[PDB]
Amino acid sequence: MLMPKKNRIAIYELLFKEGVMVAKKDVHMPKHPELADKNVPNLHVMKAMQSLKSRGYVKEQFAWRHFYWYLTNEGIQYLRDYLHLPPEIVPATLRRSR
Template sequence: MFMQKSDRNAIYTVLFRSAVMFAERALQKRHPDKSLNHLTNLQVIKILKSLKSRGYVSEQIAWRHYYWCLNNDGIEYLRGYLHMPSEVVPSTLQRRKEPVRMSRNSRDDGTRGLQRDFKEREDRSTYRRNDEDKTGEVGAGAGSLEFRGGFGRGRR
């Protein structure tokens, strides 16, 4: 399928940015990505099938959708094709900053929340240890079996 270079570059840029892409099997629909909404799903599918045949992406098909994941060879290829430096990596491969955990209560030291959590855990453990009201005589094979004739097939 013949495509303009600007369209191919747009697809490659979106793929490199996130390292994953999807497209619905409805071929005449427009692609839902904001930067690719001028393209149909057919164009996106054909470009990414071409990358799959060269071994740059892995393809997964579920229901009416295609899903593609960029592998390491594909990252290197797109870096060279789009003229990007080696420091630029897809967003799925970037390290996230760990969020700062805040306590749920208004105190600054957070001891009140820890005491509450400890109390909840203690209550659960004492519940599990307390077996006076529970009997072990339930379940399959616990009761006596009684066979009575006259039920089901074969009664004469």
């Protein structure tokens, strides 16, 4: 039983509402630091994003013990299906960044 359903949701809603995630490469930090700190371990974030990456949907970078994960159009579509959202809403990033 890898993750309670509560946790898959609590990762995916954050990744969708922000459009990006960072996580220290730590498998023993008992709580993701402030993001997802409602009893979600750091281990679950990285194991979830691993699967999410192995199927596209995400791009990953790593520097000095920290993963950085970006979303993609395929990932936007998959998460819009998986969390049952209105077919046009995304709070992640929409502005003319002058």
